[PDB]
Curated annotation (Swiss-Prot):
This is Protective antigen. It comes from the Bacteria. One of its GO terms (molecular function) is metal ion binding. Residues 267-288 have a biased composition (Polar residues). Keywords: Calcium, Cleavage on pair of basic residues, Host cell membrane, Host endosome, Host membrane, Membrane, Metal-binding, Plasmid, Secreted, Signal, Toxin, Transmembrane, Transmembrane beta strand, Virulence. The gene is pagA.
Amino acid sequence: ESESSSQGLLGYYFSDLNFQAPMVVTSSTTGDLSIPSSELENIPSENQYFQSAIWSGFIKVKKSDEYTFATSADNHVTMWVDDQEVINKASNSNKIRLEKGRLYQIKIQYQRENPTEKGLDFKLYWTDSQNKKEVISSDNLQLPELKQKSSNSRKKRSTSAGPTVPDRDNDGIPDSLEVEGYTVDVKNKRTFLSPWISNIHEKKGLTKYKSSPEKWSTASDPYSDFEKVTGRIDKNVSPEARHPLVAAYPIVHVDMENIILSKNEDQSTQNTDSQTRTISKNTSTSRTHTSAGFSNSNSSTVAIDHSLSLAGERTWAETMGLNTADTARLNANIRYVNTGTAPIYNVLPTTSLVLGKNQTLATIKAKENQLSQILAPNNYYPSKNLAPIALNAQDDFSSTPITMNYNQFLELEKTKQLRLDTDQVYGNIATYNFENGRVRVDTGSNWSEVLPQIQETTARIIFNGKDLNLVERRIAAVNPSDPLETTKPDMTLKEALKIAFGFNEPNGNLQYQGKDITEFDFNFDQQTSQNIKNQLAELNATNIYTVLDKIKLNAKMNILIRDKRFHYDRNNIAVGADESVVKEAHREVINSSTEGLLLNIDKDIRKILSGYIVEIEDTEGLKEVINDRYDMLNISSLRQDGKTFIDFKKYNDKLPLYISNPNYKVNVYAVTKENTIINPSENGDTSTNGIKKILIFSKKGYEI
Ligand SMILES: [Ca+2]
Ligand SMILES: [Ca+2]
């Protein structure tokens, strides 16, 4: 019913007599082309008088016959079928032969000076050979072909015999409206596109669009400006990318969830009758950005848990029974992650699993055209309700083993890191088809044909506000040296943040989910930095935060915006926070006992804590660390209710702390990721000696 509702003829309704001032652009499913004044609340009363109209599209017939076309105002109408004039400023009985299976272009013009009624009552009729006259049915009428090229059956542009609205890029939105501003509103389920009128639309909370009249897609993506704003688009496209100035494209990385390491079989020896020795660790994977930088590459970095998971757990090699001359195997569970704004249907990108700088251990591919589901934006493949992908799947005889020699295994143990480099080959695009009003995967449309143009013509902003993960958006922005890109509207930094990331402005302060813009930092590549510095000098402005509405974005800018609470590594991953931030986040304790601490810790702060150290201090100052090992600091868990429990029993032989004198102190320290030790020291010290830690709790026994 949604698909059907958006098919039919396309109409342009003008306040002036000569097709210059479009007030409404909208389609009609039938030959009833009326718009009653009841549906015009977003149009000034003065402009609700329509002195002209043009309709365009196609007509198909179910049965070959002679037809006679009629309107409700033939004295005011000229109509064309293909190039043949069939009505002209008077009624008539002239017949026209139409064959079944063929498509005929329809153009109708209407002009009436000084109508006494607002809106337009207008119907298109035909009469067949059996003299039965009827308003043209929905099954017979189709939209114009508002694409960059013609189809086999449907011409892209209309007859020049009749008048034409200026629409240089053939998206359907008149030149003037794209430049001056327009909005869309639904009234009784129809989408009306109208000129932006500030003193009506602003307070109704309608969205002001501007777009290039020379770019069918102003963001250089595969969906037209008209398709976006009228909902004639893949429903999987992100809400923000329904704006003509926000690019719709996939962005993919691979998330590794866990890893399992084992000894490889060798020809010289035969597997014994015994349970295979494996070491199994959770992994944490983040999409990275190396700075902003220019690189548009997809990469994620995997951190392998360095903490114990099993009581009396031995070293990796002892656990695997891996000796110096042996080879190790790796398996892992993964999912693909789409952090972009458009879906993938039939080609997942190839990924390299890399040890160190450039030792490729594995190539990970999916079968083209055999995906089990769509990889939607803000989502995963497989979906999180389904099992992940194993790199070597059960009974997959064709899955290549992933092996490391002994020295590579030592390198993996030393770094506890892997990298997943993913290409940008994403396959075919689901596009809208004006002939049937459907969205389907289009064998003729491919992401590789638009990604470079998106990357060349937009400003990139990378923002970590949602959950400290790096999210990229691209916003259409002028390139002063490229005439086609200078036809685009001005884009301010403030506006880009609103439209691309959903910043809002309730009390005249720009914020994201309750956090003021000043709680995030700004970083730019070298060229972007110089550009903005120059803009600020021209504005006589010394603080970027107070003039975000005046800083203009340009194509090929790179802007990185991060939560100021955190310390970041070279990949722009959050790895710590200042001492006082950490201390403050642990200040409110709900309960303390000899079994542990229960408290409420902000979810973002928790992401940069790797461990806690528990210590008993005597009345003379000697300190005993209870969990005195670099791999025994994983004592924090998040409960069902979102509270954090720091467990004193876990590495105290499952017993509450014994406090042999109530004036003794229990001190607890937090260790941030930045400061986390992941191996014994050079001299083999496995203790917590020298670990840079932050005191977050200290109480005497009688206080607990
Ligand atoms: Ca246009
Ligand atoms: Ca356009």
